[PDB]
């Protein structure tokens, strides 16, 4: 049951994987399946998540106060802390199209 798989960062952190690789990994997976990867936008990370059967990509910013999707929520000290927050909190607060949580690590 617990601990949830998100605690093993290897289940969702796919390092320097590009967009096309991410889409290949998420193809056919259920809603809420996700990964975290480096972005083509240097200095940034990206979250790729299945929403309504489709893969969406969101930038993760790193700032002096922490990682986050947008001000004033760039509050997390590590990517793991971010992931754990959004495992229980829907991304809809940032965009009404994203009604999903980070529920299922791609490799759990």
């Amino acid at each position: 049951g617990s601990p949830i798989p998100h605690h093993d960062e290897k289940t969702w952190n796919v390092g320097s994987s590009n967009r096309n690789k991410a889409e290949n990994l998420l193809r056919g997976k259920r809603d809420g399946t996700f990964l975290v990867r480096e972005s083509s936008k240097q200095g940034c990370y990206a979250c790729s998540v299945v929403v309504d059967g489709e893969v969406k990509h969101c930038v993760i910013n790193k700032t002096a106060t922490g990682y986050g999707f947008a001000e004033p929520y760039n509050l997390y000290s590590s990517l793991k802390e971010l992931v754990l927050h959004y495992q229980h909190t829907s991304l809809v607060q940032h965009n009404d199209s994203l009604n999903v949580t980070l529920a299922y690590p791609v490799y759990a």
């Binding site: 990206a46 969406k56 990509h57 969101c58 999707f69 947008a70 940032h94 965009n95």
Partner: peptide, 5 residues
Amino acid sequence: YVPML
């Protein structure tokens, strides 16, 4: 990328 506010 999806716009996030």
